[PDB]
Amino acid sequence: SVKLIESKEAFQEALAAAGDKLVVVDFSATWCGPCKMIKPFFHSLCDKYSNVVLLEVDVDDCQDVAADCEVKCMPTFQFYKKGQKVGEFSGANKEKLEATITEFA
């Protein structure tokens, strides 16, 4: 299950709960076409990548988190290891998402 993050504190808790695992965060908006497009693929990822943690931030529900994370396009995928951001890209690109996960997992 992709865990929804609705506060700065929940984000910090999720990063701590991940330990050493790659954490991938989908920053999305329900009105944004490419976000809706990629959402089922993003949920399907736990079947492919069983030691990666998947989080979701809805930028409308959590504007202060969005601001802190310097998002400007959606969907934006941010990659975290041991509590730090180690990569990012934006766009509904299945191939790039898989390749980026593989590069950091």
From Swiss-Prot:
Domain of life: Eukaryota
GO BP field: cell redox homeostasis; cellular detoxification of hydrogen peroxide; cellular response to antibiotic; cellular response to glucose stimulus; cellular response to hyperoxia; cellular response to xenobiotic stimulus; negative regulation of protein export from nucleus; negative regulation of transcription by RNA polymerase II
Post-translational modification: In the fully reduced protein, both Cys-69 and Cys-73 are nitrosylated in response to nitric oxide (NO). When two disulfide bonds are present in the protein, only Cys-73 is nitrosylated. Cys-73 can serve as donor for nitrosylation of target proteins.
One Gene Ontology cellular component annotation held by this UniProt entry: nucleus
Keywords: Acetylation, Activator, Cytoplasm, Disulfide bond, Electron transport, Nucleus, Redox-active center, S-nitrosylation, Secreted, Transcription, Transcription regulation, Transport
Modified residues (S-nitrosocysteine): C62, C69, C73
Pfam families named in the record: Thioredoxin (PF00085)
Cited function: Participates in various redox reactions through the reversible oxidation of its active center dithiol to a disulfide and catalyzes dithiol-disulfide exchange reactions. Plays a role in the reversible S-nitrosylation of cysteine residues in target proteins, and thereby contributes to the response to intracellular nitric oxide. Nitrosylates the active site Cys of CASP3 in response to nitric oxide (NO), and thereby inhibits caspase-3 activity.
Matches recorded under PANTHER family: THIOREDOXIN-LIKE PROTEIN 1 (PTHR46115)
Assembly and binders: Homodimer; disulfide-linked. Interacts with TXNIP through the redox-active site. Interacts with MAP3K5 and CASP3. Interacts with APEX1; the interaction stimulates the FOS/JUN AP-1 DNA-binding activity in a redox-dependent manner.
Name under which the protein is recorded: Thioredoxin
Gene: Txn
